[PDB]
Amino acid sequence: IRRAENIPTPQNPNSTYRKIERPERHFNPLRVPKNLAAELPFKSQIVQT
Amino acid sequence: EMETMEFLNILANTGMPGNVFGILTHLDLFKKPSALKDAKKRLKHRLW
Amino acid sequence: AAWPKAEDPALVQELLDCVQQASHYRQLKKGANETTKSVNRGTSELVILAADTQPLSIVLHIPLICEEKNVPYVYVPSKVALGRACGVSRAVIAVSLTSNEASDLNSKIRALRDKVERLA
Amino acid sequence: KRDLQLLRMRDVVAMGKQFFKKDNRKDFVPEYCQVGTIIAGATDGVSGRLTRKERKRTIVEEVLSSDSVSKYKRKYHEIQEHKKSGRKGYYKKLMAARKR
Amino acid sequence: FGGSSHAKGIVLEKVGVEAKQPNSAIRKCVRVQLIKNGKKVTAFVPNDGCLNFVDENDEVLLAGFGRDIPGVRFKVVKVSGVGLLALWKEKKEKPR
Amino acid sequence: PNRKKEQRNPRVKKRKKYEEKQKKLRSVKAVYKGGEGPGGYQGELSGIKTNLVKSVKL
Amino acid sequence: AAERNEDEFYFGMMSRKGPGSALTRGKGFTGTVDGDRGNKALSVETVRLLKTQD
Amino acid sequence: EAARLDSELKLVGEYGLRNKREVWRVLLTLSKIRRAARILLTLDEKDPKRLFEGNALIRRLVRIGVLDESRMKLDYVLALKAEDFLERRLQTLVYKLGLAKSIHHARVLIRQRHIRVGKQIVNVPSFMVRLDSQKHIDFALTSPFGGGRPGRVRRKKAK
RNA sequence: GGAACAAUUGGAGGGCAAGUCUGGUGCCAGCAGCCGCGGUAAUUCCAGCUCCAAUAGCGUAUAUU
């Protein structure tokens, strides 16, 4: 029917399969608030230079 | 032939009847009897 | 000086027989320099040196490296017969047949080297 | 110390053409050593000897003067890419093309 | 069973036709009635696909089954005289 | 299911398993592989480990 | 931080530089504590010898 | 058993046979001959049956040549081995002689009819070659490496 | 010249979705899965996944020994 009535078959850019790049995720470092690094006890305070 | 196998599967599907028999014909259209008997053998195995 | 001289009784002929076998099996190096390089590379199974050679210092210097490597070396009294037993069209004074891991010539070498080991 | 670092890494020196027994302590230093040089192989003097312009003072200088420094650079920039993969410039590009 | 190595039987009902897990053995089970003794037993088919081919009241050859439901001793091997495994590899058709 | 060229011709299949069994053989033990090179002696070409002992205790 | 005893005393406290607070450090305050990078006040004679070399 | 499997795999590797079927054929024949050797040792010395059967059999075995001519004792006939038997196998003699570059190369030559023993072409690479016949192993006159026509591919690129 | 002049039979394993099903003190787990949004002249996919055995013969049932 499509070849007769000269109709292209419907084809979706959004449905045709694709080759995905997965960039290797890393995350930000741990971020800990001002008051927390204040109030915590000596043994575990953070040492920063 | 395509029609032969068509018919075969139709028979098997709507129902294998009592009896079927194969007829190899046009054997006079053969130049080498060794080729002819090899054809006989292979065809029989195909049909079995 | 050539005190490891071979004797007559078919010993010499067994040597030439295995020599021709090795020339056919291509497990044979030939002539003084190639014998020298084979025993330098230590690959030689056994080494046979002529005795009728014009002055014998060649087949006297070879047993030095034969005494180093400790390979059976043996004196044969006819270099022209070595040439014929190898199939050369030239007379050879020094021959060295090496070892491979898969042959019955190897068993022949084992017997021959045991005989020359009893000899010297 | 650089020399010893090189020697402990003599594995990666041969770019796959020769693997060594990975003799790795944590402390790559022997408490006793001496820096030496080969004298003379009188058997082989036509190629088994370094020319004057190749007689370098130091091991790392020798491996510098050999080839495949290009190949080193090549592999290093591969790993440079592979670790610049999705770390930070990537994310900044995303947030830029989101902000626009 | 009996003394034979195989048995011919009649498909009663693919009990476990209302199954949730595909490859469960109560999906793959089927009650058959072995003919000579007229006895009801149940058997396993090796695969759910072959269970789709098998229908009722077809003669079934079956045999022993030896290696979540241990105790079913038989396994169906041929139905209507055709090899289930050949159907399953799509070699032959099934005579009906 | 799909089969391969080796599983198609049984002889060449039995070729390739043997070499792969021989490459792994060197990965456990050492095989003579000919003596020193004709270029001369150039060192124990892959490492030497003084804390490595392979003597079989009787 | 919750189960923190208000009253502990190690000895780094006599020897380090504390967090303090918002008011203490003021604007460069992050409650982490400073680990000296490794420099120190060079007394004169050393600086002289160095500057001589320079 | 892993010893059996590693053993047979090693054998086919060093002599590129076709299958363990061929291997077990060689083994079953080794079993017959070593069994006959054992019953000949079950006879005692200077028993004329033992003397005649032993000399006849060792003559057969050095005549096919798998026994070394140096030793002629039933103990060594019992100490015979399948490595020597597949060394005796035809294709391995071809590879040892050097008419082919590899063992599979030589087997292909014996399949597509390039080598002859003495007079005649032999298609089977497992032919028992005797000590008297080990010499006359050469290319066919119809083989392009022997002479005659240049060959199929030579013809097709020469066309 | 392999997409062929078209090797087979068993066994074990690994990889998977805008899919399905079931269980529960949230993301976990389980079984499973040709079924997926589109699309059949479209797709070109693990591109022919891996390994063990036998190999032009082998598997399974029962009886067994």
UniProtKB/Swiss-Prot annotation, chain G:
Keyword rRNA processing: yes
Superkingdom to which the source organism belongs: Eukaryota
GO biological process: rRNA processing
Keyword rRNA processing (UniProt): yes
GO cellular component terms attached to this protein's record: nucleolus; small-subunit processome
Compartment(s) where it occurs, according to its Swiss-Prot or TrEMBL record: Nucleus, Nucleolus
Disulfide bonds: none
Sorted UniProt keywords: Nucleus, Ribonucleoprotein, Ribosome biogenesis, rRNA processing
Main subcellular localisation: nucleus
Function: Involved in nucleolar processing of pre-18S ribosomal RNA.
Subunit structure: Component of the ribosomal small subunit (SSU) processome composed of at least 40 protein subunits and snoRNA U3. Interacts with snoRNA U3.
Similarity remark: Belongs to the UTP11 family.
The protein, known as: U3 small nucleolar RNA-associated protein 11
Gene giving rise to this polypeptide: UTP11
Full-protein interval shown: 55 to 108 of 270
